[PDB]
Amino acid sequence: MNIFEMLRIDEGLRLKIYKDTEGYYTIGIGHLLTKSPDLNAAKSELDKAIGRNCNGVITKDEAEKLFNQDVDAAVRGILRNAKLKPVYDSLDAVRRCAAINQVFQMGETGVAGFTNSLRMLQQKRWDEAAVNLAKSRWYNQTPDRAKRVITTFRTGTWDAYK
Ligand SMILES: CCOc1ccccc1O
Numbered sequence: 001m002n003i004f005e006m007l008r009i010d011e012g013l014r015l016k017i018y019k020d021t022e023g024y025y026t027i028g029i030g031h032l033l034t035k036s037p038d039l040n041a042a043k044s045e046l047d048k049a050i051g052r053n054c055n056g057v058i059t060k061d062e063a064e065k066l067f068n069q070d071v072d073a074a075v076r077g078i079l080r081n082a083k084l085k086p087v088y089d090s091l092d093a094v095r096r097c098a099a100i101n102q103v104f105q106m107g108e109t110g111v112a113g114f115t116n117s118l119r120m121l122q123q124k125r126w127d128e129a130a131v132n133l134a135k136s137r138w139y140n141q142t143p144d145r146a147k148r149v150i151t152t153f154r155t156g157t158w159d160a161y162k
Contacts, residue, residue, distance in 0.1 A: 015060065017039070043055070094152060133146070
């Protein structure tokens with residue numbers, strides 16, 4: 001297991017524009033196109049992202065290209081974030097994957113509501129961290145996925161991803 005395989009499990013792979021769990025137009029491996037309810041705006045974003053007229057459809061290679069960009073951008077974002085970087089840098093590699101996964105899903109803004117969880121993670125109070133993480137819209141809206149990511153934070157193993 002690694003961050004790619006982990007996020008591939010969590011996000012799936014769809015080659016046509018679809019709506020994510022929040023109802024937002026998305027494609028590939030959880031590549032968010034737009035929060036606009038306007039399908040044409042999503043199609044425009046898609047074309048801009050791929051560099052061709054896609055007509056709402058991409059190939060596996062294109063999906064994986066966006067995915068690489070998105071994962072890298074998530075990591076680079078964490079590193080530029082004065083609140084996230086020290087916590088991220090305190091973690092071992094497996095727990096860092098949980099961190100990237102969470103940021104990938106909810107964005108840096110999405111995190112940030114997680115001040116108390118971040119402090120517990122930096123403290124390596126893993127069970128307490130895991131309890132705090134589950135007290136969230138995140139967990140309640142996507143529990144099966146959040147459970148996996150939380151188990152990864154709690155254990156620093158890939159047990160939840162088999
Ligand atoms: C609670 C979210 O966990 C993290 C997210 C981003 C960077 C480091 C973290 O521990």
